[PDB]
């Protein structure tokens, strides 16, 4: 039976995984208001504890979805959309291909790549972050 | 500006430190779901940057609202309610009076007092928090 003081202390000592690019903070910076799906993928991609169902392939801003539905799940629980499946999220990607935000690598299945200038936006180089995330 | 780094860096070299009792954490702790007005008041009282509009009087869990409107304005923002004024906020305080969470100090204006067992919930004593926030008693 611990107090709030113990609760905070325990949280500071246990759950330790801060994404380098918080989708929320990013929406503020860019002033996009409501969190965007492409901004969310970045947060996950910048959060080690997510390298299970999503990570950088090592080639530039190229990333792959090891477990698509997982990203589709969290995305739903993050935007109060408990009705978010794998397709309702794969439809937003096409919109991203046309607006040239995210693309799909030829000769893959769930491999994608940011084609927008994230270096000038985020301030990080692809290779830089890869290191901060122990990318292999 | 410039890059995302700067906008976040200015938060580590040009930004204060979090309050002691953040409403968000307190909500998750007690599992109240959405932030509660009394939890939000606790955050402002545990944040040095808010001592201009709300502060501890120095006597236990008693506090005063030096700038009532600024409190109601910030509560409105945190809850996405731009039409938030003190009058409505006062409806929440009155509600807490009936639920023995916060009482109003007789013979004074804008002076209230948490009357629930916050010490046992929070893990701090009023004196302890007053020191952490460099609180100075009022010459009542």
Swiss-Prot record, chain A:
Region feature (Helix H5): 126-132
Residue ranges, annotated region (Helix HI-1): 4-12
Posttranslational modification: Ubiquitinated; which induces proteasomal degradation.
Subcellular location: Nucleus; Cytoplasm
Stated role: Transcription factor. Directly controls the expression of cytokine and chemokine genes in a wide variety of different cellular contexts. May control the differentiation, survival and proliferation of lymphoid cells. May also regulate angiogenesis through regulation of expression of genes controlling endothelial cell migration and invasion.
The family this protein is said to belong to: Belongs to the ETS family.
Oligomeric form and interacting partners: Binds DNA as a homodimer; homodimerization is required for transcription activation. Interacts with MAF and MAFB. Interacts with PAX5; the interaction alters DNA-binding properties. Interacts with DAXX. Interacts with UBE2I. Interacts with SP100; the interaction is direct and modulates ETS1 transcriptional activity.
Protein name from the UniProt record: Protein C-ets-1
The encoding gene: ETS1
Covered range of the whole protein: 301 to 436 of 441
């Amino acid at each position: 039976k611990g107090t709030f003081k113990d609760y905070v202390r325990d949280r500071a000592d246990l759950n330790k995984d801060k994404p380098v690019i918080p989708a929320a903070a990013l929406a503020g910076y860019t002033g996009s208001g409501p969190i965007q799906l492409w901004q969310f993928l970045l947060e996950l991609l910048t959060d080690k504890s997510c390298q299970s169902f999503i990570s950088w392939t090592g080639d530039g801003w190229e990333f792959k979805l090891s477990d698509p539905d997982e990203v589709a799940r969290r995305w739903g629980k993050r935007k109060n959309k408990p009705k978010m499946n794998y397709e309702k999220l794969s439809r937003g990607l096409r919109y991203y291909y046309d607006k040239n935000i995210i693309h799909k690598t030829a000769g893959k299945r769930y491999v994608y790549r940011f084609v927008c200038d994230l270096q000038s936006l985020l301030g990080y180089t692809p290779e830089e972050l890869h290191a901060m995330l122990d990318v292999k």
